[PDB]
Design goal:
14% helix; Leucine-rich repeat-containing protein 1 (chain B); homodimer; mainly beta; Pdz3 Domain
Chain lengths: 94, 95
């Protein structure tokens, strides 16, 4: 059956470091909605990697009280570029 | 690599009929959060099946302005029973 772990983690920006994960998705669908946004890769040496909670393939659902569902790619990027503390809610399918 | 279609659809209850889809998930995790809620099955003859947008395996993210993320299973059931004639559902289909 379908299984989905709910991942919640808070990351602290470090001067000179980025969060260290790339994202994909958030594409405009023919029906007008925007596709889901996923974590594509995580740099082995980065704040997210050291945290260890997130993983590539996770779907991003929330970033600092901002929903990522039916949201364009550019908006999710701009929202991750925002304060010192970034609380992320994602889902990991298995 | 990962791709996910965002499905949004509004269903109308029919007097004498139920929505006609079962759900699974919403289990309490060791970290305290509740797992995602998925559509398990859809009755071949039901409002959701006739609508055709939803499918088994889709993860439910929103039901009539109520988030389904980090929500226990019983709460999702009660919210899919305490909802009015119109049910607006937002889910994601992974491929």
């Amino acid at each position: 059956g379908p299984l989905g772990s709910t991942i919640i983690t808070s990351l602290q920006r470090k001067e000179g470091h980025s969060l260290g994960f790339s994202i994909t998705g958030g594409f405009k669908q023919a029906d007008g909605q925007y596709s889901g946004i996923y974590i594509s890769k995580i740099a082995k040496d980065s704040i997210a990697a050291v945290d260890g909670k997130l993983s590539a393939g996770d779907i991003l659902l929330k970033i600092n009280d901002e929903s990522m569902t039916n949201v364009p790619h550019s908006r999710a990027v701009q929202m991750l570029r925002e304060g010192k503390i970034i609380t992320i809610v994602a889902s990991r399918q298995q």
